[PDB]
Design a protein around this ligand. Sequence first.
Ligand SMILES: COC(=O)c1sccc1S(=O)(=O)NC(=O)Nc1nc(C)nc(OC)n1
Ligand SMILES: COC(=O)c1sccc1S(=O)(=O)NC(=O)Nc1nc(C)nc(OC)n1
Lengths: 350, 349
Amino acid sequence: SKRKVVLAEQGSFYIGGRTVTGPGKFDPSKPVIPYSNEGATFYINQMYVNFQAPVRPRGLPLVFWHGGGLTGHIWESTPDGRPGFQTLFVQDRHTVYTIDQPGRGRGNIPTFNGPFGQLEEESIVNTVTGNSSKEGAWVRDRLGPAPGQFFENSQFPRGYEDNYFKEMGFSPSISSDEIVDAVVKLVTHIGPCVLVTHAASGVLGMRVATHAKNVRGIVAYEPATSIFPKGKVPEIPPLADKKSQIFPPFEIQESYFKKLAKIPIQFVFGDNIPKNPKSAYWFLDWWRVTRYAHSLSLEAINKLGGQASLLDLPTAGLRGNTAFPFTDRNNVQVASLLSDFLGKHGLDQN
Amino acid sequence: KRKVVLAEQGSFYIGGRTVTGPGKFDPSKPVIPYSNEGATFYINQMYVNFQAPVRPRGLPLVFWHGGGLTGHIWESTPDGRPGFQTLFVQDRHTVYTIDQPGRGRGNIPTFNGPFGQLEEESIVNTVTGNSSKEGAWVRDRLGPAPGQFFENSQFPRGYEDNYFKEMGFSPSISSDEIVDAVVKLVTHIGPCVLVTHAASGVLGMRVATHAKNVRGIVAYEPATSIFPKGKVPEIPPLADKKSQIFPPFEIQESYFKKLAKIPIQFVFGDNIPKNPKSAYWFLDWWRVTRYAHSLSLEAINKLGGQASLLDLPTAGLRGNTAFPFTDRNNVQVASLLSDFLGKHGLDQN
Ligand SMILES: COC(=O)c1sccc1S(=O)(=O)NC(=O)Nc1nc(C)nc(OC)n1
Ligand SMILES: COC(=O)c1sccc1S(=O)(=O)NC(=O)Nc1nc(C)nc(OC)n1
């Protein structure tokens, strides 16, 4: 059965985070409810981790890291209920870790007794939130140029829009340093592994690898922020509206950037990213310039002796993918290309 | 034994509604920073995970976490031993675990603006509440005060950080909308058994009154009692002679009577005092809450029901906390759940 999965073991655990404290002392004779900050210890910014291990794994464990506003659900199942990459790669004899990063899903949302995110006089995260709409996500993920529209030959699981957009939500303003820190701790716990990232976690996975030699490879689906050595960001054009820019590239010390040259790295992009300026469709143009910036980032890694590559799925014969290729209708073929990358670098061997 | 063979597994979203911002969406304008303009937001949906064994027997089980928790508590214990999800797939039941609206992978309804506010509309409150480690320690009866264990405790000592890290706040989503999501899941699944915990105790009773597909309930340490409207019995205050337990939920008698048509078991752990305990607020709270539940079960049985209270010490299990299904003896706790399922024909096809 394509759906059957045999697990030597499965489970979940929490890792990372810190504690913060309220004032005063806790008295167990006083009413505990309504909950109070008095005498309080709060665990904040911890990460949820799920693992599924096949019988007799072959090669390195994979750590699947959801994109912005998502959770590990996107690796479990597609919106129309087909197997996600978690099942596919357990079947491919890898132990599979799926995370809900701090601030998302089963990860901690740091809030207390008081306005959201505030512990007495300390703002742990902002009370004002941000969150995409269905319409924003539709064009961000390139389902089509405008909400309700689909590109010709789309691989989106059409009809399951409600399921898809229901998986998306806000992220509190946890520092990216603390998100990276949690995953570094996971990588220390797991040992040698491969990070598989998506969108917002693209740049975060690159950062983890510079802090954790156990990261032996990276596959990044549609990364949202580019990374460069400090002071060496190339010229990147504004968008076609002559006012907007892509996400400010993340800059790291060259001593850390050079660590990215020591491992195989592949960035994967779906379809319908325009080649030419598209002033009518902001997020399509955003993707054009963002993919361009990533091509320069990978070049910089390769000029330092790296093993970085850009895979456009259409060049591999796969047409119509959205920015979530691993939950599209052809996600088995997308998984096959990930299996190819792992095999090429011996990451599927013991 | 950690091995598990799954005919299939996966997850999906169910339930919820939408709310909309003002104005219209223009794809030519900058989409980031995100805006409420022209926005449709999906809110209050629920996350559902399922694992199905080869050749299932009996009814699927729906495990429903307590307050401030997620489906994690059914996956593994804080010290990494198998949770009820694995144990009951091994027992050849299909197992559903949920993250209810507002918790974990369920939706937290917030937008662009102060938390929970969509323009001038308060969808959930901006001011949150959340237990501390200290409050949860005594709530769950690890011991009488933070950092202290009962001598007989079944808690997995040394894994305190892991345990408390699984808990968090819940936004002020209406209980009606949480019950609605699970009713919709139960409609989708078909005949099933609800296994609830703490805060989800009263919610699961409510679901059963709306969903004939619920064929049985096992509730671990339920936090709020339920009675027919206007028939709440005399319940004393706590030993401090000032505090009360949670106000019992009242439902119309025509709905309450549906609880008499299925087997219902409430399960309590150890170290609930028999006598007033004014020095330890949450120990005394559990004394009076357990008493209220005993009266609620009695009311169900007076309508022809089959509602029972299982005190784990009477079954030979000593020292359980208010999370018996993640304690050190959770395999023995699971055995008693399998016994209940077997007696009532819920483990046969
Ligand atoms: C599928 O492709 C994505 O999904 C994309 S594309 C751009 C973003 C995303 S994302 O994962 O949702 N969020 C992020 O990358 N995070 C993020 N969000 C905001 C509002 N600003 C900043 O930096 C200024 N970063
Ligand atoms: C282990 O036993 C529990 O875990 C208990 S005991 C009391 C509560 C819990 S709980 O699950 O955490 N929270 C709830 O039952 N929810 C809740 N919380 C508050 C502050 N007030 C109200 O009453 C409207 N309900």
